[PDB]
Amino acid sequence: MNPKRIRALKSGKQGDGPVVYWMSRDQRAEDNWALLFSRAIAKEANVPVVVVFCLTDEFLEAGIRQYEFMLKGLQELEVSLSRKKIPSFFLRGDPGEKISRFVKDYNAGTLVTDFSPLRIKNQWIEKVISGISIPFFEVDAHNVVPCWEASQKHEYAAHTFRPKLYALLPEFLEEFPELEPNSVTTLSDVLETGVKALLPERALLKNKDPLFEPWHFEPGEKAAKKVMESFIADRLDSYGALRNDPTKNMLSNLSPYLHFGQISSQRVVLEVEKAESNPGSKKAFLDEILIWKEISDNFCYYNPGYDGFESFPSWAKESLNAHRNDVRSHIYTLEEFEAGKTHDPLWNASQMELLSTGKMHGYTRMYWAKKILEWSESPEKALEIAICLNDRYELDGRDPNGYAGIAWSIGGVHDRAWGEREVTGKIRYMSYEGCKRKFDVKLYIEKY
Ligand SMILES: Cc1cc2nc3c(=O)[nH]c(=O)nc-3n(C[C@H](O)[C@H](O)[C@H](O)COP(=O)(O)OP(=O)(O)OC[C@H]3O[C@@H](n4cnc5c(N)ncnc54)[C@H](O)[C@@H]3O)c2cc1C
Ligand code: NA
Structure with missing residues (x-):
């Protein structure tokens, strides 16, 4: 459990109640770093570990295709946490006041969240930092190598970022330990009142028919792994030659799962590297999911005006x-x-x-x-x-x-x-x- 994945956001007096994991980006129970150190902080300090999710008020800025995909995966997530005796609490509202009240109400000991270089995530961090007195920790549970550890500067090319990242896989590309359950300790309603708000702005064709087709990608942690296994078994060998052909479905089709954090990118890299296929096809896939994916985190983390x-x-x-x-x-x-x-x-x-x-x-x-x-x-x-x-x-x-x-x-x-x-x-x-x-x-x- 490399400590380089953990960085400190605010120092304070260690609290008394459960260690609260503020899940934002990595919506999964397995292969989730952020939960593991949360349990590690819950194991080496003898405290229960809980997971808190915030249903923010910027969901109407998107469509029902993302909202329903995320809530369905959250439905599968919270039943997996229940099997580990880890309760999950979902809050509706801005995290600046929701997280602060939750920490005080439950007398939380240490607050931990996952990493995201987006401006919106930063805005939530500043409000939370000013309203809490418990220690605040953050961990990069989305990248194989920590974003601040791969490079501390904006990289201007994949030519210069590749050797830097490729020198740290032996340090960071490692297997995931099992999630230790707690010793001892509705989502359908929010979805119903949610989609009733985005319904008038739903994308539609001329007559009356919604344009979105939701049978292409099944949400959830379990469905994400099946997509990964299907990609390795059927599409890994032909990926290098058919990467640039839109007429063929030769891509991994894992981006919606990776964006919501329903599957770890490190697990994908672990399975692909152990798999045997064409070497050019494998090297092409590893470049996209490691070099180009993690340079985007570097780009947003070191360029405040990344969208400008x-x-x-x-x-x-x-x-x-x-x-x-x-x-x-x-x-x-x-x-x-x-x-x-x-x-x-x-x-x-x-x-x-x-x-x-x-x-x-x-x-x-x-x-x-x-x-x-x-x-x-x-x-x-x-x-x-x-x-x-x-x-x-x-x-x-x-x-x-x-x-x-x-x-x-x-x-x-x-x-x-x-x-x-x-x-x-x-x-x-x-x-x-x-x-x-x-x-x-x-x-x-x-x-x-
Ligand atoms: C204008 C634009 C918008 C994009 N929007 C998104 C987005 O919202 N989210 C997103 O994850 N990717 C985005 N992509 C990046 C890329 O298109 C997608 O990664 C990729 O198409 C996702 O399909 P895939 O995972 O099934 O294919 P794959 O070829 O298998 O890619 C595998 C993984 O590598 C990543 N990836 C692949 N290509 C790139 C790339 N050029 N840059 C960064 N990462 C890459 C993706 O995370 C991806 O899941 C965008 C690219 C561009 C140019
Ligand atoms: Na605009």
Whole structure:
């Protein structure tokens, strides 16, 4: 149990009651670091361990596709904690007052939470810190190597981040010890009154039919593992060659589970490394889930304006500035972008998959975002529209990987300089003709 995963947020007088785990990002009972040290603090100090979840008031900022996915997984989570004699308490409201009152009411001893580099998580931390006197600990339960330990600076490329991370797997890539149960110590209602609030804003087709199709991804910790096992057994070997083909379902399809923390990324890395497949296919998968996933946490942790034009590289910021008011071929508003009413059928098909399935293919996720920069009056508007569409309709949205992906597509973050072109500038360019030579585009639009 490496202590480098644990960092101190506020020092105080150790309390008396149960050690409270404030779960935010890693919604799982197994392979969850944050629970293990919470039990370790509960084992080496002889106190009960409890888990507290906050149903915040920003859920209406998204759709019912994310709300119902998260609550269904929470339903499975709390029955797994009951089997370990670990009670789970769910609060409705802003964590700044909910967490502080819970600690005082239950006389909690030490408060522990998992790590998330998002601005919203930080906002909740400051309010909680000012309202509590018990020790406050935080742990990186989402990354194989701690975000502050992989690097203490913003990495400008995957070229420089890869050797740094790859030098610390032997230190941190280790197996998970079993969850020790406590010695001795409704979700359906909140879901019902919840969806009744997001119902009038549900995405719909013309006549009356909701566009979302919820049978593609079953939520829950148990369902996440089955997706992982199916990916290793059936899609690992062909991943390297079929990574960039949207017409084939050769991806791991684990992003909604990883974003909600229903499955640990370290468990995925452990199973894939022990699995035997094509070496190029394996190295391609490990790069995506280790290098590119954890560099997004670094990007958001060391760039406060990660969702702004200020976080772009200097070469890119100058390049788009020289091409700021170049006469755009098309200019589409947010609603035209949202409903999929552009002149590009390939982009329209990408939005259709986003609207219907809630998870758009990774290769088209790069064409989709970069094309917004083409048909936006300014790069700031383009960054804006991409974030709004991503965080609203993506099951894996509102994630550090999302903002790093948008920054990569629009601002060239973690990329390099390419051929200068109008409007887009020096940013990497993806053309519709270029996609025709890479995969069968006609099949993509036909399906969506
Ligand atoms: C504009 C944009 C928005 C995105 N939105 C999200 C998002 O909200 N949440 C999210 O987790 N990923 C996001 N992605 C990153 C990437 O598209 C997804 O990781 C990947 O498509 C998820 O599908 P997968 O896990 O089934 O495929 P896989 O090829 O299997 O990827 C496996 C894991 O690696 C991660 N990953 C894969 N590609 C990237 C990448 N370019 N950057 C960072 N991580 C990656 C994902 O965590 C993923 O689960 C976004 C990428 C871009 C360019
Ligand atoms: Na906005």
